[PDB]
């Protein structure tokens, strides 16, 4: 059966005895059957690549993989080579001799090349059209793959005019199933992907959900709070106190927009008896490395940071993530809040919302969009930037499951919140606080 082959090739070539996840498996099987175009939207470290690489080995012919830049392309080729897989890369960073060695290999009946990584520039160039023409005619194309598929959308962050030719490409390669992959797609970006690449219905979709059961999402209104600083300390004390025998157990992050706010919030927290240190661009590199160190090694349980917080920094027992100030985007909030509870254990994610904060950020977004518009003219992404903020304001100012609002933005199914946010745990108490906010709104 096909399962017997796929399991076997997974083991013999790639080395694994079972797939990471049954979603990775399902995607993989759907590409193998080859009746449908496929969209795979999984985050970094999911093994999204396996879902087109493994099926490529099990087919009769060649798999063209279109990736936007060679840095990306190169990583894959080296690893595939190490697995003793017959891979090749066609780019304009290559000598005429290497280029022509490869163009030649492709014009063979039964080429050496099983998988061909190619840049969009090259996949459109006159130099390649005839090679492609011969490959289709000899029925040697098993699959067209488009990586970083989101680049085709003007509503995505990384638009490339290059990618607009890919739809015409897909059309010519009609007989061949098309796979498109990315980590990052709003529903609007997914609709742009399916349209612009001319994917064919039914498009089968494999999309890792945002939802993490062990995170508890809630919003507090700084306007309706006598001791904001004191509220925060209690939130930190709850979160850090889930093993009283150890005393303080775990660590937490407080996120601020400004450096002044960091320094101040660190001092306020420290006084009320929760040891906290400020991390921002203001400090010397040495102070930063020392503060990061103290947090990582649990000397100091709480770090107060600007957007500067390290990408390479991933800790396992982050018991809470407090946004003192609303973030620039729903995506930013998801990512920053999502640094919590990577060890699977219960964690708390809290947004401190003020309309004054909303207004300060709202404006700063529009200012830095204006500064980009003077340097490169208009872009439909500028509209996306503003709507990315609206979605987070809407998260704060509506009644409804917090996890569900996050899922609607990203395009997931309604998640299984087990009284896992404020609204699901007590709907009426949320209505109370929302009503209370609207009383200040009068006039």
């Amino acid at each position: 059966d096909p399962e017997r082959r796929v399991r076997s090739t997974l083991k013999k070539v790639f080395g694994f005895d079972s797939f990471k996840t049954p979603l990775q498996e399902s995607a993989t099987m759907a590409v193998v059957k080859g009746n449908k175009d496929v969209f795979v939207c999984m985050p970094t470290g999911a093994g999204k690549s396996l879902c087109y690489q493994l099926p490529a080995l099990l087919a009769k012919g060649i798999t063209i993989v279109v990736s936007p830049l060679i840095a990306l392309i190169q990583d894959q080729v080296d690893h595939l080579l190490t697995l003793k897989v017959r891979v090749s890369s066609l780019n304009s960073k290559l000598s005429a001799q290497e280029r022509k060695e490869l163009l030649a290999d492709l014009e063979r009946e039964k080429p050496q090349t099983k998988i061909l990584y190619i840049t969009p520039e090259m996949a459109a160039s006159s130099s390649f059209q005839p090679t492609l023409n011969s490959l289709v005619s000899r029925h040697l194309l098993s699959y067209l793959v488009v990586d970083e598929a989101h680049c085709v959308s003007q509503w995505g962050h990384d638009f490339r005019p290059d990618y607009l030719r890919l739809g015409a490409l897909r059309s010519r390669l009609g007989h061949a199933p098309c796979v498109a992959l990315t980590a990052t797609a709003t529903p609007q970006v997914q609709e742009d992907v399916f349209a612009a690449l001319h994917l064919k219905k039914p498009v089968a979709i494999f999309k890792t959900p945002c939802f993490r059961a062990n995170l508890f999402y809630d919003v507090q209104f700084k306007e309706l709070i006598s001791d904001p600083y004191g509220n925060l300390k209690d939130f930190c004390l709850k979160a850090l106190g889930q093993e009283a025998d150890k005393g303080l157990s775990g660590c937490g992050i407080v996120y601020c927009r400004t450096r002044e706010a960091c320094e101040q919030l660190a001092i306020e927290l420290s006084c009320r008896g929760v040891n906290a240190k400020a991390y921002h661009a203001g400090l010397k590199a040495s102070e930063r490395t020392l503060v990061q160190n103290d947090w990582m090694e649990e000397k100091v349980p709480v770090i107060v940071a600007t957007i500067s917080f390290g990408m390479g920094v991933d800790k396992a027992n982050v018991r809470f993530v407090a946004h003192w100030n609303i973030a620039k985007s729903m995506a930013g909030y998801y990512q920053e809040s999502g640094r919590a509870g990577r060890d699977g254990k219960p964690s708390w994610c809290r947004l401190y919302y003020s309309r004054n904060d909303r207004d300060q950020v709202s404006f700063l977004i529009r200012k830095e969009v204006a500064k980009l518009q003077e340097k490169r003219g208009n872009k439909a992404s500028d509209k996306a930037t503003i709507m990315a903020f609206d979605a987070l304001v809407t998260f704060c100012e509506e009644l409804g499951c917090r996890h569900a609002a996050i899922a609607k933005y990203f395009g997931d199914a309604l998640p299984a919140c087990a009284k896992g946010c404020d609204h699901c745990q007590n709907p009426t108490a949320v209505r109370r606080r929302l009503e209370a906010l609207e009383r200040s709104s009068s006039w």
Partner: nanobody
Amino acid sequence: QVQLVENGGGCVKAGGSLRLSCAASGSIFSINRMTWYRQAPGKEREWVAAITSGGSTNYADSVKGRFTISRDNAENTVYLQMNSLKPEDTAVYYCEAYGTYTLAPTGEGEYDDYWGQGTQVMVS
């Protein structure tokens, strides 16, 4: 897969009124365009009216002001209010679910077009 099942047809007299309901089943997240077509026997399929996700609506000239469509967003269901009916309007009425995004919490979905079963509408 997805079910479109239309309801709320029957026989009524000229000048009378019906309201059709089309119900969409399955894990539907969104529908790009929901569209009302009618098939009069021995005539070509006729485009009636349609509504975008976000509630933009347009209407055939032959039914403008008499007919109006709307969407129970909660229900993933559309309605076609037909008042001032005429013998012309006698037909089978069905819906097209263009750009129908479906998705389970597993992360496994589809994106497809779907067609309805139809409801009979007689105008004396």
